Paper text:
Evolutionarily distant proteins with the NOX catalytic core have been found in bacteria, including Streptococcus pneumoniae NOX (SpNOX), which is proposed as a model for studying NOXs because of its high activity and stability in detergent micelles. NOXs belong to the ferric reductase transmembrane component-like domain (FRD) superfamily and are composed of a catalytic core with two conserved domains: a domain with six transmembrane helices (TM domain) coordinating two hemes by four conserved histidine residues and a C-terminal cytosolic dehydrogenase domain (DH domain) containing the flavin adenine dinucleotide (FAD)-binding and NADPH-binding sites. The DH domain catalyzes a hydride transfer to FAD, which subsequently transfers electrons stepwise to the two transmembrane hemes. The structure of SpNOX corresponds to the canonical NOX structure, with an N-terminal TM domain that coordinates two hemes and a C-terminal DH domain bound to FAD.
Residue numbers in the entry: 2 to 400
The structure:
């Protein structure tokens, strides 16, 4: 759910709508519903830019994309009502036909957005990018319909133009510029290690020092013959300065390609560090819960803090001993650090993680990284036991 950590972002949405409505209600009341939709559309594009301000305002990128989907639905509902109240299925003049085409493209794209199971991610993104064409068609419709009412020196013109320009710039940046100018960390793959039958560790030497905090992730672009160059999110699993570690589990065609065919010496690009699961900023007492590859952020901390400064109970749940990674590293860390408690749960034979019996520290922060299904029950049990325990969770998807 949403909390005060996102309130600023929420305020930015709410102030966006009221200021829009009060504007239209003052100039063209008959156009509150379309105009609001326009503002909403703009916000949708602004919510896709992955800018650090967005993460600061909405806490996490997952909440950013949740609000992005909400603005999309609000836009489409308002646009459908506007079409019903002010037209039919095809316009009589070019200005109305632009709106017809724009609304058809918007509806089709929103319908296809919930077709990700049947569509590869890159094809999904390429289909999704038609929102820019729909937005341009809608802007053309709006401006040829309104004429000089939106080209004068008044509040309505400034508001409409400002939101339209912000949406246009956000869409252009995310579609055409983000992968070309916003990936300034150029690196070379120097070492690869296969941890088990389906997980590979990648070591990257960068041209510049990379600043991150343990528990954060980054978008990686790989440049190799036979590899896709689309950015994929991976948690940083160690390294400092000009060295980075990423631990990739096989979960699809691209990650299987990484496990099988990735070569040392290939080019990689990284943009920046994302994430709200900063372990070093938590309480003194901490409980770590990792499911499978969700161990990747905590490992980073272990690799960057040889002497543990917190009281940590780590629960690592894996589906069989063949699916476990970094067991020797975790055992060495537990032996070296008396304040580190290690609980290895083989879910095939030991059952599952149950917190109805295990104790929790009083003033404790609980970090969760793993499947949402098994994290939800654990969070419910922990909240039932100690309702004031701080809880942070990070998932491995956006849609
Ligand atoms: C914040 C975050 C941190 C992550 N950290 C790790 C990590 O440390 N180790 C690890 O092994 N995996 C991690 N992942 C998951 C990793 O991003 C996916 O496994 C990978 O991108 C899927 O590639 P694929 O083509 O092999 O999978 P596919 O078979 O194409 O898809 C499988 C799943 O991955 C999603 N997916 C596919 N391509 C992308 C993409 N370009 N961007 C986003 N999602 C995509 C799909 O929506 C689907 O849910 C993380 C994901 C997120 C969001
Ligand atoms: C009017 C409606 C919408 C507009 C204008 C819009 C706009 C955009 C744009 C321009 C991008 C950038 C794509 C790129 O990287 O090239 C994007 C990404 C994204 N959109 Fe939308 N979108 C809309 C609706 C939706 C819906 C309905 C969903 C989910 C059901 C959604 C989820 C996402 C996600 C998850 C991403 C990021 C995917 C990734 O980069 O991995 N959006 N959106
Ligand atoms: C400030 C914003 C907007 C204003 C002032 C506005 C104004 C109008 C007007 C005056 C009409 C009547 C046209 C006619 O009767 O021929 C109309 C129709 C229409 N508009 Fe908009 N519009 C706005 C935004 C949008 C957007 C963003 C879209 C689509 C993305 C859209 C889609 C449509 C559609 C589909 C019609 C139906 C036309 C028809 O079939 O006759 N409108 N709008």
């Amino acid at each position: 759910e949403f909390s005060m950590k996102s309130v600023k972002g929420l305020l930015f949405i709410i102030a966006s709508f009221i200021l829009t409505l009060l504007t239209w209600m003052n100039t063209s009341p008959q156009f509150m519903i379309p105009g609001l939709a326009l503002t909403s559309l703009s916000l949708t594009f602004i919510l896709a830019t992955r800018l650090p301000l967005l993460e600061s305002w909405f806490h996490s990128l997952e909440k950013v994309y949740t609000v992005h989907k909400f603005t999309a639905f609000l836009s489409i509902i308002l646009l459908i009502f506007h079409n019903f109240s002010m037209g039919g299925l095809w316009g009589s003049r070019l200005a109305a036909q632009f709106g017809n085409l724009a609304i058809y493209i918007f509806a089709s794209i929103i319908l296809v957005a919930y077709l990700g199971k049947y569509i590869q991610y890159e094809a999904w993104r390429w289909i999704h990018r038609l929102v820019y064409l729909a937005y341009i068609l809608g802007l053309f419709h709006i401006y040829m319909i309104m004429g000089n009412r939106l080209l004068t020196f008044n509040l309505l013109s400034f508001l409409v133009g400002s939101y339209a320009l912000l949406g246009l710039l956000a869409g252009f940046y995310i579609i055409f510029l983000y992968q070309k100018i916003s990936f300034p960390y150029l690196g070379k793959i120097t070492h690869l290690k296969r941890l088990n039958h389906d997980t590979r560790e990648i070591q990257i030497h960068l041209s510049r020092p990379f600043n991150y905090q343990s528990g954060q992730f980054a978008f990686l672009k790989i440049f190799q013959e036979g590899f896709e160059s689309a950015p994929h999110p991976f948690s940083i699993s160690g390294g400092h300065g000009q060295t980075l570690y990423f631990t990739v589990k096989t979960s699809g065609d691209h990650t299987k390609n990484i496990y099988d065919n990735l070569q040392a010496g290939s080019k990689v690009t990284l943009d920046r560090a994302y994430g709200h699961m900063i372990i070093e900023e938590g309480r003194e007492n901490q409980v770590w819960i990792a499911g499978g590859i969700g161990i990747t952020p905590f490992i980073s901390y272990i690799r960057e803090h040889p002497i543990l400064d917190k009281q940590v109970h780590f629960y690592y749940s894996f589906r069989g001993d063949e699916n476990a990674v970094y067991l020797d590293l975790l055992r060495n860390y537990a032996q070296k650090n008396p304040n580190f408690e290690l609980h290895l749960i083989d879910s095939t034979k030991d059952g599952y993680l149950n917190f109805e019996q295990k104790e929790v520290p009083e003033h404790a922060t609980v970090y969760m990284c793993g499947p949402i299904s098994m994290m939800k029950a654990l969070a419910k049990q922990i909240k039932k036991q100690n309702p004031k325990t701080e809880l942070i969770y990070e998932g491995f998807k956006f849609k």
